[PDB]
Amino acid sequence: EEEMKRLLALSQEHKFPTVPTKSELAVEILEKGQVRFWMQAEKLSSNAKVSYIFNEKEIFEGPKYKMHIDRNTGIIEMFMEKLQDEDEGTYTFQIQDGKATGHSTLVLIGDVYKKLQKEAEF
C-alpha cells in the first residue's frame, strides 16, 4: 500500500455503446478539474501502444501526472489533478491498437476547461 491516489483513478467498465476492439478509452469529467482516465484492452502483453500525448509531447508520471498500468485485467489508469492554467494544455491520448484508434482529446486550458466542465457538472 502506498498509491492511494491510484484508487481515485479506479473506475468500473461503464461506457459500452459502440466499440470495435476491447481497447476502450474512458474519460469522466468532474467540475473540480478532475480527469478520470482509465483504459482497458483485450490483449495485454505486447499489445496496445498508448501515446500519452500532451502538447504533442509524451509525458511521464511526476507531480501533476499520475499513471499506472494493470496487467491482470488490462486497466491503464491515469489521475490528473491540476497544476496551473499556464501548465494545463491539450491532452491527447491515442491508443494505437490494430486497426482501431483509442483516441481521446481532452483540452484543459484557462477558460476553455470551465466550459466543458460545466457541461458535464452543471
Please describe the topology of this protein:
Elements: H1 5-9, E1 24-30, E2 34-40, E3 49-54, E4 57-58, E5 67-69, E6 76-80, E7 90-97, E8 100-107, H2 110-120
Antiparallel strand pairs: 1-2, 2-6, 3-4, 3-7, 5-6, 7-8
Subunit structure: Homodimer. Interacts with TTN/titin and PNKD.
Subcellular location: Cytoplasm, Myofibril, Sarcomere, M line
Function: May link the intermediate filament cytoskeleton to the M-disk of the myofibrils in striated muscle. May also contact myosin filaments. Also binds beta-integrins.
Largest sheet, described in full? 4 strands, antiparallel
**Count of helical regions:** 2
- As an assembly, this protein is monomer
CATH topology grouping: Immunoglobulin-like
What gap, in angstroms, lies between the N and C termini?
A: 35 Å
Shape: globular
> How much beta, percentage-wise?
35-45%
Supply the helix-strand structural class. mainly beta
Query: What proportion of the residues is helical, as a percent range?
Result: 10-25%
Indicate the CATH class.
Mainly Beta
The count of domains is 1
The CATH superfamily turns out to be Immunoglobulins
Order of helices and strands: HEEEEEEEEH
In the CATH classification, which architecture applies? Answer: Sandwich
Number of strands: 8
Query: What does the radius of gyration come to?
Result: 14 Å
Instruction: Give the neighbour order of strands across the main sheet.
Output: 1-2-6-5
PDB class: cell adhesion
Keywords: Skelemin, Muscle protein
Assembly: monomeric
Entry title: Skelemin Immunoglobulin C2 like domain 4
